[PDB]
Amino acid sequence: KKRYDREFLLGFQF
Amino acid sequence: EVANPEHYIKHPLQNRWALWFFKNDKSKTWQANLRLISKFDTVEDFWALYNHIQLSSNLMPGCDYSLFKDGIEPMWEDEKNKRGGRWLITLNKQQRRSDLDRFWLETLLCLIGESFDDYSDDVCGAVVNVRAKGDKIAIWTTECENREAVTHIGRVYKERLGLPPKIVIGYQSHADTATTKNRFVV
Ligand SMILES: Nc1nc2c(c(=O)[nH]1)[n+](Cc1cccc(Cl)c1)cn2[C@@H]1O[C@H](CNc2c(O)c(=O)c2=O)[C@@H](O)[C@H]1O
């Protein structure tokens, strides 16, 4: 149900 | 009237995840070298933990990171691991400098982002082994006789890592491992 794109995840790293 | 949740909530993951650490110590047992680090269930807490721990390529020989769903221990004798196996990727020594950390991050993102669609309930976790003879990264599956789930996970994983089509990775059952033959290849 909760699915996330790699580029969306990588935007919260900093 | 209430505050808009998107301005303040942490972004929730589908699953809680646990990061484990294996310390290379021949005086202790395997069971006692394997220890929990911490758990997280949001994108923000995942990065809080990733950003302060060592990269795999900087670990000492014999150590492992393991990321598994809350409730599943990173050992094959666990209830959700014993009928499954793992998509195994073997890396040459030169890959340690160039691919190990990038592959392991991508692997983390596939798990926590649920990149295997409806076969994501078949995923148990992933392990990176830091070894002098060659590092290994692997995604563990709960049932090796679920052909379509295992096949889909293997294929999506291989293209997420950017592996060339000619490079073949194998899926090996934990019960056979306990020179191992591949049940599946992509
Ligand atoms: N009780 C228990 N001991 C284990 C386990 C485990 O799950 N449970 N594992 C992990 C594992 C994962 C998938 C398939 C297999 Cl066959 C084993 C390694 N050990 C112990 O370490 C030995 C080999 N382990 C390692 C490798 O292979 C490495 O690299 C490395 O380290 C095993 O024979 C056991 O004595």
Author numbering:
A (entry chain B): 621 to 634
B (entry chain A): 27 to 204, 210 to 217
Question: What did the original publication write about this model?
Answer:
Initially, the 40S ribosomal subunit associates with Met-tRNAi and a group of initiation factors, including eIF1, eIF1A, eIF2, eIF3, and eIF5 to form the 43S pre-initiation complex. This complex is then recruited to the 5′-end of capped mRNA by another complex of factors (known as eIF4F) consisting of eIF4E, eIF4G, and eIF4A. eIF4E is an indispensable element for cap-dependent translation initiation and plays a major role in recognition of the mRNA cap structure (m7GpppN, where N is any nucleotide). Under resting conditions, eIF4E is kept in an inactive form bound to 4E-binding proteins (4E-BPs); once the latter have been phosphorylated through the PI3K-AKT-mTOR signalling pathway, eIF4E is released and can associate with eIF4G to launch translation. eIF4E is overexpressed in numerous human tumours, and it contributes to transformation, tumourigenesis, and progression of cancers. eIF4E overexpression facilitates translation of weak and highly structured mRNAs that typically encode proteins involved in cancer pathology, such as proto-oncoproteins (e.g. cyclin D1, ornithine decarboxylase), angiogenesis factors (e.g. FGF-2, VEGF), and factors related to tumour invasiveness, such as MMP-9, due to the ability of eIF4E to stimulate eIF4A. All complex structures showed the characteristic cupped hand structure of eIF4E with the ligands occupying the cap-binding site.
The positively charged N7-methyl guanine system forms the characteristic cation-π interaction as expected. As predicted, the squaramide occupies the α-phosphate position, making interactions with the side-chain of R157. The chloro substituent of the N7-benzyl group causes a rotation of approximately 90° in relation to other N7-benzyl substituted cap analogues. In turn, to accommodate the extra space required by the chloro group, the side chain of W102 is re-oriented away from making the usual cation-π stacking interaction to a position similar to that seen with 7a in the presence of sulfate (compare Fig. 6). Furthermore, substitution of the phenyl group with small and electronically neutral groups (3-Me, 4c; 3-Cl, 4f) retained the modest activity of 4a and 4b, whereas introduction of larger and more polar substituents reduced or abolished activity. However, our structures highlight the flexibility of the m7G-binding pocket, especially residue W102 that forms part of the cation-π interaction characteristic of cap-recognition by eIF4E.
